[PDB]
Subunit: 189 residues, 8 copies
């Protein structure tokens, strides 16, 4: 009976949604912890955390058999994964846009932009630790990321989520980093 | 080279959105026209426009491969179709819930509540032209849609959409029709 | 020199916008006024107000020289004008979609849809007076507007804006005018 | 026939909207591409992209016969064009307010204001690479734009839109770039 | 001392608000209690409750020295008082428009309109108990109120508020009560 | 550690909230089913359902050990319990305002008002089944309920939830029922 | 006869409200105008506009005879007046909370809080010019307004409305004016 | 007779609401005043106002017996108190998380984030008057509140309130302070 079909379907969907929440939740805990680690220096720890998070992403990819919902929740989680990943990669010199994950275009671009602000914070801590070279290479990757991401601004911001705004944010932060670098050189006299 | 990949994919999605937009718009125009005819009396042509629409629906059933969109846009047209169909089925005795259209539970359910309103408008017009039989049968079906759909009200609003509110609206229309019918019987 | 230009254009547009605001609001007021004067029985005085409005309309058309501002403000006052005119034509048997003035299409459509409800007012009141004939005619024109209008719901928003909501409004209004027509037929007796 | 005229004009307008939107988009993709090129150095290809865009402005101007939709949708793209142009001029030492385009005054003013931020970014990036010269000339055009622009904010916001905020932003950048300049000066005694 | 004057007046105003609110509340509790009494039949105690309420109107009028807060908050209670009064007058055969209170015109008009629904309720409940008389006299005052009141809706809604809606409601009840009347007539041939 | 305390606390609260949702959910299913039963005639069935529902209310009352949340969700459920109960009681002649449950004043008053619209629907079905006496006694209890509930209008509607509006609704409905009765007598000729 | 009265009062209030709207808006415009004229350097012309405003204010005070309408519209224009005056007094060393005109307390407080941001504008621009003295003065008065105002956050809304929001606004503005002041002290050098 | 009972209970609730309203208002005046003094320099009197406030808090701790309200109104004041307290603790070296106040987890956490802003305002003022030691210690505490509080972000927003957004705000304030401090060191 079509009503019993749609009823069964609805229960499937509900249970689904609940566990999906749980998974995405754990994944985001790992992402975040990872970023805080990198920030505080403990990058091996970070790597391991990220690894856990990717496994969890496999469990997530499992759920796309119900495309209604799923995307209605995943995005956030996904971005931060991307974000955190790029972050390790940047502060390790192994930075690349060649992150081969099962992720949506909007989540990918926004995670990458999200990493910019992270790199500003890092470059600030280094700047204050009187380390100018790390700061400067961070700045280099900030810039790189921005310059390359703008290419996508053309697309309707509905299609690409809140990119344009995010990028303007990034941009202004990049400039602030640069002003700071200069001020740090003068102030290291 | 990835960035080039996610960009090709974006271009796709844009094309697909434009196309789905136009499909669904067409399909709606038909569902709408179908209803307007069922009211106007030309039930045959209603069956026609309806068929055209369902054909367009099977044309919609392609873009599942683009789940990043699809569902989002689809609902309000799917729910529209489900409405018109049910309406026809009630205004030709053949009222059933068991129709297969592969439509999101929400657009299904809500499409059926959505029907009740169109039923009370009909029933009322018939009541004005004397037809108490129409009106009585409609009161039967209307009460059935309500009695049945209410079983799904306990579900999280996030999946069943706003079924409860649509339902209460219907209920009230049912009462107002029962009442409009105890009148008129004063001839 | 460039800036001198765009500056002068600006000052011009400023004074223009002020005046446009005054004239538009006076027009709208006069439109509405006429509509309520009909519902109050002073249909002649209502003709006087509607006249005043249709006059001010001209002075409003004179601001099309400034397509910057002319359009961001057009909508509402003229929606009301269309309403009042639709109504007048309707309560006077010679109702028509053919009203020889444009006036944006959105304003036009929303205006008719908005005159549906004033028609219900007039029809329930005609029902109270006793007169079922005029009541049935008003119910006819109401239904007609609803049908002829629903055809444009296809079009997206932006171009159409109000329509869908205003037509579901007019709809529920039509159901009520009808129910009232039925309970009205207990005469019949008497 | 009133309902049929309106249906016609409706179809026309939606079509026109689709087109205008795509073309505006194009003009914009080139505007942005251009500014990126300037920031890269490739000023030649920059000027080319500008060219393509200003070609597009023709196709766009072709739509001011539908004033509804035209003065709504047009702002962004135009305003950003003016930005690209004014930017490029400023970095070629050939900065002027005497750009001539069929363009809404808001879009114009806002285009210059918007250019100011791009100047500051260029001026910092140079001032990092040492070029104290380029920097100072940039700060110069910056203050220029802010100073002459500020007298247009005696206009009611609705005529002038985001100008205020932009000038606020502008103001800030100016004051900051100054500091940055000075700081690099003492930085490169050593 | 400007900041100190302002704090003073502030404290005064908040206090005045607390008081006005409580007193208005009182006046209202009696207004409602009154209408309930009339619906019960106990017209004596009805008249008493009216008394208590109109006594309260003194304490309330005492606040129009703070026009800020007074003309905002006052509407409901006053309006409902005029309702109770007009209602009781109508059912004592002594219905008049010549209530005299220090009361805002919106509140006044709205009070009469509001009374109309209470009349319809009474008229139905009598017409159920047979009293065809009481019913018909009620319908009479109903039509009176609607008919006189309708000429006030030539006023812009902001001055007149809910009147229109209430008159809408009113109109409805009138037309329906008529029906009901007739239906009971044929009902009690048998 | 105060941080770990507030952490543990937060987990407790979360689990709590989840199961409380489940309970209130089941309760409301029973309420509603009960009302549809009574409407369709099957009042013994209805009784049993209501019984289930009260047991579930015991399980709910269990949770008041976390008064933050709880009330932030219960209300709805509670009202309908009240509503449905009064409803059986009214159509059974055993109507009373003496429903002795562990319920909030606002839930209680609003449930009771909510029952009025139910009784209108009932009295309409009876009216159409040409049964005028049941209609009339229902109308009697509608009226009684209203008349008695108004007494509470005085209280600030924040304190008593959306009572006043609810009562005006009820009122108009009562009048509609009455017009209908009359029209039913004339139309039974 | 009663209705004749409350009718005449109504028509009176209608004309009055129209005229009040015009006068209020003109006043507000003139206030704002003055403020932007100061931020554009034409402080004398700004003196002229602010004069015009303070004059129109009187004609506005003349409408206190109609406490129905006078208060539902008071707020915004006078908030702006208070703003422009506070600002004038502040950019002219002789700043004071003691401005000998009331003017509702809400309008007063919100007005000062809203002048905080115009003060930051003036202070950042003063910082750009080079002048740190006047900058520090402005920063003082800003901070002073913030402190003297926070004292009123206790009071509920209704009486105060805007406050807490506008003060968190002013706050973040003060932090920015400060940060700018610090990076401004790289002169010091030069 | 029940209806009379629930009526008495209502009257109660109204009374309790009025009273709680006034208590919390008083308490917030104090918390606020306390902060304003900590900024102004009168740290002692800040300790005083704070104490009066906490006394009023133990006065608040009665109305638990009226859960139908209480929590609802309390949060924004409780969260306020928690703020002021933490602020004092940081501007006198004695910064700790471990304080007992029996306050809703949300008002606790969000109170501590709330603190960071006041810290950056302080730190900035000190930075203007030359005090780099103040500012540096504040940068330490600020970073600590952020680092620690971020552990609770994974929780449903419905229980932890909007902690994440408040936190990002703070973070940004921390950067802008680090930056404002790399300046000024240019003397
Ligand atoms: Mg981040
Ligand atoms: Mg730019
Ligand atoms: Mg009433
Ligand atoms: Mg119910
Ligand atoms: Mg704070």
């Amino acid at each position: 009976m079509r009503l019993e079909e749609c009823r069964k379907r609805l229960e499937e969907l509900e249970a689904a949604r609940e566990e999906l929440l749980k998974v995405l939740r754990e994944m985001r805990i790992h992402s975040t912890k990872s970023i805080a680690l990198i920030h505080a220096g403990k990058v091996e720890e970070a790597e391991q955390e990220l690894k856990k998070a990717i496994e969890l992403l496999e469990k997530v990819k499992a759920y796309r058999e119900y495309p209604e919902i799923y995307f209605y929740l995943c995005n956030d989680a996904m971005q931060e994964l991307v974000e955190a990943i790029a972050f390790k990669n940047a502060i390790s010199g192994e930075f690349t846009f060649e992150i081969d994950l099962e992720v949506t275009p909007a989540a990918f671009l926004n995670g990458f932009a999200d990493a910019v602000g992270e790199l500003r914070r890092y470059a600030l801590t280094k700047l204050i630790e009187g380390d100018f070279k790390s700061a400067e290479r961070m700045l280099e990757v900030m810039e790189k990321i921005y310059e390359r991401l703008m290419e996508f601004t053309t697309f309707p911001d509905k299609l690409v989520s809140g990119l344009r705004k995010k990028l303007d944010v990034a941009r202004g932060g990049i400039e602030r980093t640069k002003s700071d670098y200069i001020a740090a050189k003068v102030a290291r006299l």
